Design a protein around this ligand. Sequence first.
Ligand SMILES: O=C1N2C=C(c3ccc(O)cc3)N=C(Cc3ccccc3)C2=N[C@@]1(Cc1ccc(O)cc1)OO
Length: 192
Amino acid sequence: KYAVKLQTDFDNPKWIKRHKFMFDYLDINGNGQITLDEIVSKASDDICKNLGATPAQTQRHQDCVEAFFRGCGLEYGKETKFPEFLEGWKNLANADLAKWARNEPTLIREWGDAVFDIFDKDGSGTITLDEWKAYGRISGISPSEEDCEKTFQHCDLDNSGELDVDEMTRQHLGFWYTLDPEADGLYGNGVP
Ligand SMILES: O=C1N2C=C(c3ccc(O)cc3)N=C(Cc3ccccc3)C2=N[C@@]1(Cc1ccc(O)cc1)OO
């Protein structure tokens, strides 16, 4: 196991292409713009509803999603195009990396906590391969049952073969923020 690299690379076509792929994935209608309203609706009225989240869990998850995407520029009643979106990610990456460097919880970690809570009815605090496939399909970020397995092959699992928020946060920092080579493949062949 290795530490995460905090060095950014916002100019790398690979990092920009990754967020472009996701932006397009979020831009359902392909109108070239998204709104915090769509992101929150996807989070609360789609994902949380279909996973069977309680009212409380759904609210906490919404609060975290709202804070996260506000981090990268989004806002209610405001259309955000890719250019602004990308610039938003640079600021968020910088802001979250600054918090990590001071041992303050990051927005990416807090989003993770909300997601894991939905699958934590017994106290384990982890997510099993089967629950991730569920999340992958419902959220649409990894509908491929195969890619989800690759996610679990890629990540370091606990003694039960289960994924915990600490490891997933490590991976996401590298995948979404630093374009760390060690993170490549986190989502299988589903996200470049
Ligand atoms: O990381 C995640 N995501 C990143 C992006 C995303 C979006 C745009 C970009 O440019 C880059 C990345 N989009 C979605 C899907 C989603 C979007 C909006 C509302 C709800 C869900 C998403 N779901 C997560 C949630 C998560 C977070 C931390 C964890 O430890 C575990 C799980 O799972 O991997």
